[PDB]
Design a protein around this ligand. Structure first.
Ligand SMILES: *Cc1c(COP(=O)(O)O)cnc(C)c1O
Ligand SMILES: *Cc1c(COP(=O)(O)O)cnc(C)c1O
Ligand SMILES: OC[C@@H]1[C@@H](O)[C@H](O)[C@@H](O)c2cn[nH][n+]21
Ligand SMILES: OC[C@@H]1[C@@H](O)[C@H](O)[C@@H](O)c2cn[nH][n+]21
Lengths: 829, 829
């Protein structure tokens, strides 16, 4: 592997610095230093290399003064960072040789690091990939979010059930972030509005400090190092404590550690709306603080130095761009108006024009329960002024609507940011649209439905706002990092340029017929299957028969992702084996992983099923090798980089129209797995890219689901007209998979049979047939690898560099780049 | 000043490392680095020098295997640490030159650091001095306590009143400690005892993790660097959170941050007993954890390697020594029995013999309200086994007593560790005596009363246990650090050896008659008076007339310290000035500082008085320079190092028999101030050391207070027979010092007049006469300085090196040393 150069001098300098940090920084010594200390010695040694260009990149922005892109997200699924750092700087071969010469194994050291899991799944990982791409593309970008004490809970399966253990990821600290207490900002909550003729005053507010923590974000070999600033909550030592009146000091000391709860933990609602005051507080927390830093940097640039002297915010939109990732940081709309109108005293009209030219909203899912609609009373109480500003935004917006569509009264009702009813609520999505100059979907099909259904009204008023930005995945982490084997064989043929531009992967189409290459693609895949089997064994259990089809569905447990459909299929393979015990079937290992939301009972049950089924199957003598059913515990970014490169079959079975885009699919595609999925989200574009013949699409298309809704879904029909399906439902309701507790899956079955919003039965037959075809192709090794080479070669479009390049040129108003910024070397500023 | 050598090479290496930490460690650059970053760059640069010998000293102990001294204290008043570190290593002149060449002023940088205030006052500072001495004396000592998030509250005086603001001392972090999460230990609480024939099991306990934080403790120029390990509380991520049963995960995440409250804040009860379950938890917290580390290091020495193979604890007392600083860590007695009996399965008799040979208790005050007596129900609940073990200790102890004094039934009642009544309690002091082989007082007079009154019974049973260890103060911090001016002039005459052995100060008696030296002692004192006036001005207010007697009483506000007596005296000087407005009196500035316990109403009032009086006095035209009354805000270790060296008069007015020892007195003595005090605590030994003629002793002696108690104290008598005293009481009750609120001091007066447990009036006359004599001597500059040279020269006995040397030889069983251990230089272990 060409993971960089193992320079003689660099290697010697590295080992020196490694021993220095071990001594001074860790205060350890080789005769007492554990793999962990060794891991930290390296981490710090590598960190040093980041700081140089980190300082230089940020300074670069002050001088040149390019437009700034602020990516506001309440999630940043970072995963480990040492290998990525090592790769993006060209330090992997130097560090390997260096630690080797020390007698340490870099692989074991990397396994010491823990996931910086400040995210649930797709939303956060997208942000993480985006961050990496914006840096690789030389964009003056800043990732802003919350610094959760504990990211997403660690998953433990005890007795087939999920257990929520806390993610104490900061236990041994994090050698990547840099606390910046000197830059702690004040956030205000509650209060009231003193209204005068000369202005509005948000007053009598409870203060919460926002302590920033900066993490360096290195671009691939271009010497660009951006910043991700995460806010940590801290109580102000003054209002609290000093108030001897009842506070009693000691109690107040303890109560101090109560406002700090804002950045305590990530809400485990993997895209789901819970109107919790804490969440709202978390959102406002990061919006206000972030927006202060934004205005600050705008004021200290060419304006607050010269230009029109009196800070004229006209050029604010040309210098600032804030991207609202979902509706979570939507408060940025009224907050920017608050600051500009109340503090900066700009007229309303001026502010709004400026606000809309700065903000852009990204819609991630059309599913209604994930939409944020806060009860008016909540906002009225926690943020009075913002609510007053939202009401004013709304009145002017609707005033425009009414003028565009005169008399269309229901339209007004439909386009009101304010929803009436038993509890008046505020539609955050509507806010973002009225307050952004661009709104985008995360996939071709997704963005169309947005203009056709949900935002059809908004689209009719402002067709110019709506766009599409089909999601990306980063080739550094998602290929070079997780699959150094595949990256090597590809590199031996086309060189390493692909890493910075995946579209070059198409050149591999010239090797579809090439014995060597075909054997290589097959060899790496098996190597990877071996490494994962080794990992599953050493870390958990079972010698998963590597000589089998690694069928894998890893993603958050949701009724629309359809793990249940896979469960049905699994039971099917088992039952067929029992009917014809001597009929050869392709040996298979079905791996499903993901975490269920804590209060999501059904999801909990589903997890329980995937394991319950395994108990039977995995122990039937008759099967004894042929079929394995396994649940992958605590599915996270690091496990993703593990399982995926060892994947044969990429399960992407969402009900058509549900999965807005998906990202796991693209990873599987990049890594040499064949996809079995519906015509949903990005699956559609993936199959178009590789040709529907190199894919395994099946089931109802969006139009079919709708026609079925039109007349109503009646699962009983499928149960009556499908005898093999009928058999499984009976094995469930009887207790075949729950002997000790026969009534166990009664609610799963009841839902399936009577309340399936995702039409599982309506896709069972076409699904089992599709799996038959896959097994069939697998029976032809050479043919499977040939279709694989056809998948990898057309993954180019699914790089976040392409996505980001689109956001930059189409929404942000910035031209990405790929020129290597210089390194400091020795000079200190 | 000879604050070390400013080596050309060392200076260059320092500046290099300073810029390195600024860049890499702080990620700053000279064009954006504030004095704070500059302060941190230096702090880290200096920290590096500590680590080398730190590692080497600890390693030294493993090989040599000397007896270990564990100093358990729930307080360690550390103050700043950069200058001390710089001095103890011989780095002050190199660092000054280094930063100077950088253009930075070391003095401003040092002022950036904040007090590591993990202590209230005397108890903690003693521990801090002791730590420094044990290191200077080459003792294998380890300071163990709690790592409070917030030390003692910062004091703010708003409108003449105290305001409790929190001490967020860890805000910008602490570059001295080293978190050691890898060594986190488990502490158990609550539960029950499973009792079998084969043993006792403390079970069903709530767990709390103890994360250690190590701070290096450098000995003066001997290259010895010991360790102070402070425990931080952290919830275990398992029992908490995973329990989905009602825990709800999120709530449990928040509740996780509830057990961590154990090391949250230092209880502001500057030596006072509040039976709070949190405090008890704080005490047990540090006892268990510490004791685990102790047993661990004992097991990995010559025993758990070879020796009798099966860990034989017979030699435990020869290897381990734990010093109970006050009754706070008394739980170490039953806890050591628990571990040895329950876990190690030693017979009771064997364990007890071992326990008593290991532990030694230090009594700090005879005042009853400061004595720990926990309600039996509390211990029964929070620590069931320990309570059962205490009952067994008691029964055997009393069995010995009864056998020594047959029939003495009341004795048994008096010597019972168990106190009967409406609420049965456990006398912690009795525990410590029955469980320690040595008990000591903190001053000659204090230790005698212990054998004569309070522990007269225990003394009669075991006369051999009782000793005296008159407190010390450290000459490095308390002279060399705070008074580099005095240390210089002394050094110019007798060399720098005194720093390591203060007894050499007696040589200054040869200069009592020496014009040069007399002028120098006078010159430094004025320089210091100038520097403090400059500090008071730049940091707070008033150009305190440096041409005045700096009369200062700085210490915790308590009725027995008698700030009120000083208040009476102050009002007296003012009133006399009004009677005879043209009669010359020595110009004076009376400074009083200290913090009142939050719920201590009277103390709060007293503070209010000291300021109330100033309002009048400080603004009377007639006075206009002659008399200033000032309250020094937020009196802490750093202010102590400030005010003291600028002190003329050292107010030490405690009611005879109340101040067990005192330490502030010694500091004032070392720094060139004359003392006006009672024959209390160490005042007695100080006057004996310098000859009662070089002191200003006054008031009732212990015998007089008692004879007054015998017949009863009637303040009315003094009010009736002292017309000037009578006048002040009327100015109070009328509202002369509280015009707007005439009834303001009614409770102060009521106490004074009817419930003064400290006989203030009974010492007023003799007190004003003594102050007349002091003013008189002050009128003779040469004579004052001559008596001063007589005070400084006899301070030798009050060094903690002497105290510690006594603890070592008389209680610990270790011979202190003063040989310079080697430095690592370049080699890395
Ligand atoms: C990228 C990623 C996701 C995406 O999964 P989808 O449902 O397939 O799109 C979620 N979780 C993890 C840990 C990821 O790696
Ligand atoms: C040493 C010290 C003490 C001691 O004061 P006393 O009452 O005089 O013995 C208390 N507080 C501080 C900050 C100290 O420096
Ligand atoms: O856009 C990133 C991912 C997307 O790929 C998923 O399909 C969608 O359900 C979602 C919601 N939030 N973030 N996401
Ligand atoms: O022993 C140190 C000091 C001592 O000098 C004080 O006089 C005494 O009141 C006390 C209580 N706790 N610690 N102390």
């Amino acid at each position: 592997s060409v993971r960089g150069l193992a320079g003689v001098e660099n290697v010697t300098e590295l080992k020196k610095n490694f021993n220095r940090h071990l001594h001074f920084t860790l205060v350890k010594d080789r005769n007492v230093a554990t793999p962990r200390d060794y891991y930290f010695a390296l981490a710090h040694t590598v960190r040093d290399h980041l700081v140089g260009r980190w300082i230089r990149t940020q300074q670069h922005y002050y001088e040149k003064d390019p437009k700034r892109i602020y990516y506001l997200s309440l999630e940043f699924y970072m995963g480990r960072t040492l290998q990525n750092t090592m790769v993006n700087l060209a330090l992997e071969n130097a560090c390997d040789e260096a630690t080797y010469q020390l007698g340490l194994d870099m692989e074991e050291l990397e396994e010491i690091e823990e996931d910086a899991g400040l995210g649930n799944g797709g939303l956060g990982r997208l942000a993480a990939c985006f961050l990496d791409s914006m840096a690789t593309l030389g964009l003056a970008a800043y990732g802003y979010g919350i610094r959760y004490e504990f990211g997403i809970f660690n998953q433990k399966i005890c007795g087939g059930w999920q257990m929520e253990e806390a993610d104490d990821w900061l236990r041994y600290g994090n050698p990547w972030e840099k606390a910046r207490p000197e830059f702690t900002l004040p956030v205000h909550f509650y209060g009231r509005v003193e209204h005068t003729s000369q202005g509005a005053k948000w007053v009598d507010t409870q203060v919460v400090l926002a302590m920033p923590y900066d993490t360096p974000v290195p671009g691939y070999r271009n010497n660009v190092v951006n910043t991700m600033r995460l806010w940590s909550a801290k109580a102000p030592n003054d209002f609290n404590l000093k108030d001897f009146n009842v506070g009693g000091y000691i109690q107040a000391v303890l109560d101090r550690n109560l406002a700090e709860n804002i950045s305590r933990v990530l809400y485990p609602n993997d895209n789901f709306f819970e109107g919790k005051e804490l969440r709202l507080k978390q959102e406002y927390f990061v919006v206000a603080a972030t927006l202060q830093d934004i205005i600050r940097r705008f004021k200290s640039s060419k304006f607050g130095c010269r230009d029109p002297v009196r800070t004229n915010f006209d050029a604010f939109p040309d210098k600032v761009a804030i991207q609202l990732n979902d509706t979570h940081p939507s408060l940025a709309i009224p907050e920017l108006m608050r600051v500009l109108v109340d503090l900066e005293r700009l007229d309303w009209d001026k502010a709004w024009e400026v606000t809309v030219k700065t903000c852009a909203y990204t819609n991630h899912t059309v599913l209604p329960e994930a939409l944020e609609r806060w009860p008016v009373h909540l906002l009225e109480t926690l943020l009075p002024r913002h609510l007053q500003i939202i009401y004013e935004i709304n009145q002017r917006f609707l005033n425009r609507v009414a003028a565009a569509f005169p008399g269309d009264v229901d339209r007004l009702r439909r386009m009101s940011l304010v929803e009436e009813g038993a509890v008046k609520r505020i539609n955050m999505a509507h806010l973002c649209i009225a307050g952004s100059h661009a709104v985008n979907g995360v996939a071709r099909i997704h963005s169309e439905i947005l203009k056709k259904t949900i935002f059809k009204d908004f689209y009719e008023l402002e067709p110019h706002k709506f766009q599409n930005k089909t999601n990306g995945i980063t080739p550094r982490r998602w290929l070079v990092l997780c699959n150094p084997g595949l990256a090597e064989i590809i590199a031996e043929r086309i060189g390493e340029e692909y890493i910075s531009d995946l579209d070059q992967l198409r050149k591999l189409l010239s090797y579809v017929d090439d014995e060597a290459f075909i054997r290589d693609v097959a060899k790496v895949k098996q190597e990877n299957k071996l490494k994962f089997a080794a990992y599953l064994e050493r870390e958990y259990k079972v010698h998963i028969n590597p000589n089998s089809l690694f069928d894998v569905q890893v993603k958050r447990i949701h009724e629309y992702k359809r793990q249940l459909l896979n469960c049905l299929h699994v039971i099917t393979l088992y039952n067929r084996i029992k009917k014809e015990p001597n009929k050869f079937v392709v040996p298979r290992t079905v791996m499903i992983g993901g975490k269920a939301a804590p209060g999501y009972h059904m999801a909990k049950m589903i997890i329980k099923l995937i394991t319950a089924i395994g108990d039977v199957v995995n122990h039937d003598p008759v099967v004894g090798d042929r079929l394995r059913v396994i649940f992958l515990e605590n599915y996270r970014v690091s496990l993703a980089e593990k399982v995926i490169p060892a994947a044969d079959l990429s399960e992407q079975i969402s009900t058509a129209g549900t999965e807005a885009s998906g990202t796991g699919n693209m990873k599987f595609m990049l890594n040499g797995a064949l996809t079995i999925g519906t015509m949903d989200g990005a699956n559609v574009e993936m199959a178009e890219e590789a040709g529907e013949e190199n894919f395994f699409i099946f089931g109802m298309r969006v139009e079919d689901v709708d026609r079925l809704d039109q007349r109503g879904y009646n699962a009983q029909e499928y149960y009556d007209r499908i005898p093999e399906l009928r058999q499984i439902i009976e094995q469930l309701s009887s207790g075949f998979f729950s002997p000790k507790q026969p009534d166990l899956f009664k609610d799963i079955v009841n839902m399936l049979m009577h309340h399936d919003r995702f039409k599982v039965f309506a896709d069972y037959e076409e699904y089992v047939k599709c799996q038959e075809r896959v097994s069939a192709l697998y029976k032809n090794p050479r043919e499977w690898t040939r279709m694989v080479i056809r998948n990898i070669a057309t993954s180019g479009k699914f790089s976040s560099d392409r996505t980001i390049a689109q956001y930059a040129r189409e929404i942000w108003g910035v031209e990405p780049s790929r020129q290597r910024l210089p390194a400091p070397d020795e000079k200190i500023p």
